[PDB]
Amino acid sequence: TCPFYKKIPGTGFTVDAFQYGVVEGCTAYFLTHFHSDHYAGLSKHFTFPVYCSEITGNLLKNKLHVQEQYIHPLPLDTECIVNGVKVVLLDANHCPGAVMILFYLPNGTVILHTGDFRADPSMERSLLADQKVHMLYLDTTYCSPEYTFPSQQEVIRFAINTAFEAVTLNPHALVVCGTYSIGKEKVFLAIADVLGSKVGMSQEKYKTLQCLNIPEINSLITTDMCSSLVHLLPMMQINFKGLQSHLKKCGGKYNQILAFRPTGWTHSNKFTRIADVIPQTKGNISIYGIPYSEHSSYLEMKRFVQWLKPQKIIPTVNVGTWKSRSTMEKYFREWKLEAGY
Ligand code: NI
């Protein structure tokens, strides 16, 4: 049964609610982004209208085989009427195709559902600037002050400079980057760009990337692993055993691996600056964990909410424990008292 924080009151709508069977009263299912915890339940047998971005709809059609007649892509930053209600999709600064949804209820209430997002000051100048929001359904993934990490630009700087130094010292080094979902494509694209290489990957991952509307993508990626000196592998293979095994398959082209695991936050963030990050090494294999986040830090979250001044907040992440729920509610009240709304 579908939980309350996935239902939009006063409408026939649900958000990210595909794993509950046929939801009573739902006339349109919205999908914020193509991550498995959110799409869980979709397939070629789904027969209700799905509303989403263009990029999410490319992935529904090609990867999950949802039939075309049930996919309703909407342009961003554009007022659209769905089943008698005005909605807007906004860029969520998460993975490719990820949106926030603004719903303009028939009774005058305005609701924002962030989906998964990384809050940014540039959102203070979207169509959000123009009106009041009563209710905020918020991605609270990192809603505690211990969760700090650097900008995406600092992390990419670190990766490019690290990869370029290593391969210029040793032209026989291979670079490997982990992946298990869409998102974080800048990591492997920026490293391949500095090295003058395409990114090599499996046919399944190439297919997924071809759905993302990235400019000039045919120039950047390939299924010919032999021609490439940046390879992508499943995140599970980014360990000394998996990397050893991969190096065996490369026909004596390479005598060293430098590998990257983009993680979210890890507790080494509570001590170590990006500048000071070091790898784990065994023999001719080095593995860097890099804190590339596609979710708000605590400070970015707090800044967005203090700017928006919602009348009510409904968390969508960390809702299963009483300790989590109580922690979150304390920070919401601090933020409101400090800012005065
Ligand atoms: Ni996500």
UniProtKB/Swiss-Prot annotation:
Tissue localization of expression: Expressed in brain, heart, kidney, liver, pancreas, placenta and skeletal muscle.
A GO term from the CC aspect: nucleoplasm
Record bears the keyword Iron-sulfur: no
Record keywords: Cell cycle, Cell division, DNA damage, DNA repair, Hydrolase, Isopeptide bond, Metal-binding, Mitosis, Nucleus, Phosphoprotein, Ubl conjugation, Zinc, Zinc-finger
Superkingdom, natural source: Eukaryota
Known partners and oligomeric status: Binds constitutively to TP53BP1. Binds CDC27, which is itself a component of the anaphase promoting complex (APC). Binds PIAS1.
Family to which this protein belongs: Belongs to the DNA repair metallo-beta-lactamase (DRMBL) family.
Protein name: DNA cross-link repair 1A protein
Native organism: Homo sapiens
The encoding gene: DCLRE1A
Shown residues in whole-protein numbering: 700 to 1040 of 1040
